[PDB]
């Protein structure tokens, strides 16, 4: 049996004194060695399948996972060393996870419970920036259009570009600033929306440790908010990250633990990276004491979430973690158009296809415009995020295979020529936080190639 | 129809005129010769099963029990007079109980809702000294031994041998400080684990009224703790009590009524304790107002709460009272055996096996060494109490009923030279507060039997 | 120096193994002879005044008073021993007092801080039944003729003569529920009088430790209230105030500690009376650990605090305090006659004026009726008693001494043929809280009589 | 006139364009030579005075330390660039500050108000190891010897030498652990003393930013406690506690900012130093925003803050503060002697007499051993700084000098060969958290040479 249950004290224990190595043994050989050896060994093939249904196939994706965590361990940059788990200390996380937990306050809080491949239940809408760049004049508006949306459960934080006009550069005192205001703002929006115990999920602007830690106070970050942390690529974790960790279950704070495992990076191919992926979700309840994991397979050259393979992956994975855990768990939205365009519609209404049908509980999207130009996301792509979602919600798997192949034909060809999209002051009423004419026109065409698929809104 | 809804007011109103009664009329005749009547009108016959899979048998004890209550009613120590109960006014009370509740706050916090008999899911692991005598050296420590295991859930409160050097006597105003005192070290020590909002059971160092009253208070006990009160042997109970259960209920705090039928007692074998227990299960939510009832059959030789016979009696009890109502329960651990020994831990697993299938929402333990030897119950127990409840839920009850009867055997021979085992400083590295590598070879050994039993982990 | 700085701790410890000695011995020998010996010693006369201007008797009487604490100790009735403190451990006490504090939350939170003899600044008002007995059916609006006068600050409890019907019995579940409505319900009063963060003081109704340690909870005795715990007579304690004290500390609540010494009790006379006053004021802060303390000698035989006698000792005790010590105190109300009488008001005059001239903090009335007769305390006495107070703030110390001498002379032949007076029922219009016509004449022929003495409103 | 009112935001924007400059030539140049400019062109001698009284030198000294700010400005030793001020934010800031705050919360709050040279008044007593090292096994018995002490209003944090067995590595979640835990356990203390209110400062155990960041918590650090931030040696500073000011500006939180300015350090001599002194008094209140500023000016050669030389420093520093400003502070207690001896007490004595005197607001101590001893600080040392405190308050300064001169005389010619003294767990009864008799009797004979230098207590 195990000493103790493992926690971010034990890793950091361990960081110190393990086995040393390089990160390239790690990056260009350990990973991709063993991920490449248990595809194989465990012949694994996913035939084309975006959602499982062949469940043998999937526990072996399982326990393929589970090994590929077990033999090969977590590398810590810091120290340059790897922290080796037992499989006992595995089991005991995963025989262990949080069962459910609540987001937000008051009339305004939702209950996060575990669905199930296929479930009739819809998944939690987490909608917002997505982690984007917002301009500091228009960040209450910005999330305002999120909040005013009742597909909306909770906030997924943008990125503020300045606070008090200024760079929230990291470890300078701006950076605090940031951290702390981001959350009083958005909380600020939502209540200007009428929705004042809105749940959010942060903090974002914030990158380093102390940053990241400065974020809890009145008004503020809180208890019933999720609470980010990120591990590296792949299985791999900075000290930084650790004693954020320490931080968040030292306030008893719900913590999501996040990973955006990459397609074709050191890892290989689809299989290759799925492996990984359901490795990293069993590493978030195990390191990191996850409440629940982000995932977000994202393809190493259109850097998107939801290309034919990145879908795959989710969904596989989410099926996979679904079926033999009750590890609760949701997944990021990058799509490659901008807001305000019929491709970003599409883009993101195949993920949520995909993510609704393959069992995850939280949908976080929309970092639009692949969440690195400012201004570039509105509340509408959550809205199509959500309606999709609840259209998923209780079909078939069969269909939504179907369904998915056909929806990922109409866009998979045009990532390298995804219109670049317009930002939240271009096609909305900034004033009023509502879209314009354009928009809902563009969103209307976006729902009738859904509807001509077989989806009912 | 009834007056009002039955509370401790009525209680301590009919306590005062009630029908005269010497205590021994009560625990030498009224008491057995009911029990001993109803067994044999009803026919209760066990014929050696730990969990019942006889309806008609299980409601004919459900019957029983609702006379007993019914006909006997309860004794007053303090005024030594019975109070009676009118039937209607104990279908209103079985009728409008608890349904669920929360325990613990923040990330920590934990739902407490019914489990069925042979019911696929977990009950709530609760872990602690179990009201045994704590050095206050190492107070600290030992909680944290629980709240460091992942397989517990809430804490149950050890026994303060002092606070700041000194006996909490009863009714001095150490008791008073022992009693705030006991939780707030408790719940720090759930913090140092990382689980600031663990919920807690007590109060346990303080045993007058006006002790357990002091209790509640700012970073102690709050309302979402289990409260306990005691109900004597057998439906007996003395005015202190009656007075705390008004202190709570003033409070809005989370009522934890406990009870502990004696096998061989006043009420006789195994079917009449049975029928006393069913009885108290009822008293629980009748004159105590109680959220859940905490059972915890004992043998009057061994005094164990895992003997063939007790583990019948409980079994038996809450299948009854789980299939007819919606009573919320838990058992307590009483193993003859002491920490770092084989046989407590296969004693704690055997009640563990019993109380899962049976449909126990809520398992606390472990009072290692009967609970009344200083420093004797750590974590470890309370791991394996946990692992093994994972391990028999969703198991066919039929099977349950041969593994206990097997493993029963491999202890029942050996009460009278039960090993008396370790303190925790002897078995666990107090600093770090990690088990040492005896106990985790002992706990593994025992495991290994389990497994040989049939136990799938 | 002394071993730890003297608290409830401290006491019990002591009380266990202090020198044995019967309660008569103590009563009617060692309290009565150290009284006469330190009166004849430090050569106390002080020659019919009521507030003192010869600071050199002054200090001999607060040296009397601490050599009386010192050498006597207290007796514990509960364990018949004596409990001794050493030089060091007194002065420990008096040197590290309460400064000053707040009762109430909110718009009506009042700041206490320390009056000199003769102070410009006026005392708190605390009004209320003064521990009165209270019929049920108008317990809110009783306590709210008091909340509606903007002379009170804060509100002094009456007791409950039943609470959902019943007698409040100590140890009884009524006495806790008691304990809790009655704080709940005058706070409501108070809400209704547009007041709800009004400070209160109590618990009243309960009596027993258990009970009074009940009274803190939600809605009700919070920390900012004044909770009480009494001194015997003389220079006595029970245990059950020990553990009270105990628990008043374990929440942070600022702590009350009462005492009324008897005139021509075993203390003897005047002086030796005064001596024992004294005493038990040091004795607050060392035993109790009191943030204040409250007075009220008594006429043996009228029972009543506003005597010529029990004026005199009162003036010289807080004169004196208030002179050589930073201890905050007051003085609490017992006229002979009733509500609605010219001499009820008069009576409780003449102690406003003499509490606020000789350096009170705090004034508690008024208990009209000797505080036992149900019903009969108003608002309107406590209007007087503030009224009073604010005349005679500031006024030469000379004059207050001719002016006492006057008013006392109108009323102290009449003590045997007090009137009756009437209850709040009937000279209040109960339905919307105002005084009758009959009162409001009353209370101006009363005013006029203190205006023709020389007091200025 | 001034842009706007500087803080620490402005404070990082000049710290990136500031003039280069190596810390050499801050150090060894800048620093030195404008201490001895300012000396000479003011004329500054402090003629042998430990306290001033003469009015015009003072006004001299706060000119030159007002002057040494506003032409030297402060190093940023991150950017090695420095920071200049304009005299008119210099005034904004001075004109300005806080005047009075609340520490900790219910009954144990206190006031904490300016006092002027000679107050009558006595400081505020923090009492607390004084940031030394304390074993974890006796971390709450140590601070429960300081809430037990009634000359002792607040707490000032030890440092955890462990946290669940492990050093608090700075950038470890350890750290973090500890951060946390630290006032969790030192109020947890105070609550177990009867005083669970009690206000802190720190947190002590954490050293980097993150770490200091993440110690406001529940249970923990709070807004009513005071939050440290350090300057260093001198008018420099590192961006850590930029971002630190701003984490506390944020969370509402009360900041004392400090400073040991070195004797015979970068700035030189006696009047060299305090004039440095003056200007981190300044800047306490520009750069840190502190609601009350801590001084400690240190013997190069001794590491002690009560030689001859130091006092006078702080003495004159204070004098000259709280005579032209309404800046609040306090000093920090360094003896070179540790606990149980009766130098210790005696060098404590010495401070404790020249900072009441000499105006300061809160004393903090005592560190001692010079605070690098493991477990050599106990609630006695507290207990000697409180009662001289009081002593001291109120006396003429001619006497006070008088006093100090002969008092420092008496050990001056032993720093070298100062008694080790003993720990805690070697002079106090641990369980009863109770000095030894021991101990007693130094205090004792410490106390009877304070009386014989006329000192009443």
């Known amino acids: 049996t195990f000493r103790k249950s493992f926690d971010c004290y034990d890793f950091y224990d361990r960081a110190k004194v393990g086995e040393k190595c390089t990160q390239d043994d790690w990056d260009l050989m350990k990973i991709p060695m063993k991920a490449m050896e248990l595809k194989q060994k465990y012949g694994l093939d996913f035939k084309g399948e975006f959602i499982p249904t062949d469940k043998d196939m999937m526990e072996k994706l399982f326990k393929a996972g589970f090994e590929m965590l077990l033999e090969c361990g977590i590398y810590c940059t810091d120290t340059h ?39 009739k239940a819809k998944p939690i809408v987490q909608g917002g920036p997505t982690g984007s760049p917002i301009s500091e004049d228009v960040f209450m508006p910005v999330h305002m259009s999120y909040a005013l949306e009742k597909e909306v459960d909770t906030i997924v934080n943008g990125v503020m570009t300045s606070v008090r006009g200024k760079s929230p550069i990291p470890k300078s005192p701006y950076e605090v600033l940031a951290a702390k205001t981001e ?14 115990g809105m749940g959010v999920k942060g903090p974002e602007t914030s990158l380093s ?8 106070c009145t008004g503020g970050m809180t208890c019933t908010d999720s609470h980010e942390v990120s591990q590296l690529n792949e299985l791999k974790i900075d000290l930084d990250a650790i004693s954020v960790i320490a931080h968040y279950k030292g306030n008893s704070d719900i913590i999501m633990d996040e990973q955006m495992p990459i397609f074709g990076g050191y890892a290989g191919g689809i299989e290759e990276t799925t492996i990984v992926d359901v490795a990293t979700h069993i590493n978030a309840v195990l390191m990191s004491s996850a409440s629940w994991h982000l995932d977000g397979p994202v393809h190493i050259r259109w850097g998107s979430t939801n290309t034919r393979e990145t879908l795959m992956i989710a969904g596989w994975a989410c099926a996979t973690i679904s079926e033999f855990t009750d590890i609760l768990s949701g997944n990021q939205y990058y799509p490659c158009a901008g807001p305000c365009t019929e491709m970003c519609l599409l883009e993101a209404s195949a993920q949520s296809i995909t993510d609704t049908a393959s069992g995850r509980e939280i949908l976080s999207g929309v970092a639009s415009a692949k969440g690195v130009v400012t201004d570039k996301t509105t509340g509408m792509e959550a809205r199509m995020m959500g309606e999709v979602a609840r259209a998923t919600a209780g079909v078939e798997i069969s269909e939504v295979n179907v369904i998915l192949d056909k929806l990922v034909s109409l866009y998979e060809k045009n990532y390298a020529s995804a219109p670049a999209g317009k930002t939240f002051q271009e096609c909305y009423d900034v004033k009023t936080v509502t879209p314009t004419e354009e928009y809902m026109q563009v969103y209307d065409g976006a729902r009738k190639k859904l509807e001509d698929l077989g989806l009912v809104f």
Chains 1, 2, 3, 4 share one sequence.
Do not use: H
């Not at 440790?209 to 809890?216: F, Y």
């Open 81 to 119: 060393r790897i922290v080796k788990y037992t499989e006992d200390e595995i089991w005991d996380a995963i025989n262990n996870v949080q069962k459910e937990f609540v987001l937000g306050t008051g009339r305004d809080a939702v209950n996060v419970r575990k669905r199930s491949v296929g479930d």
């Open 183 to 196: 959350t009083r703002l958005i909380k600020n929006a939502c209540a200007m929306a009428g929705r004042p």
């Open 209 to 216: 440790a102390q940053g990241n830690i400065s974020a809890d």
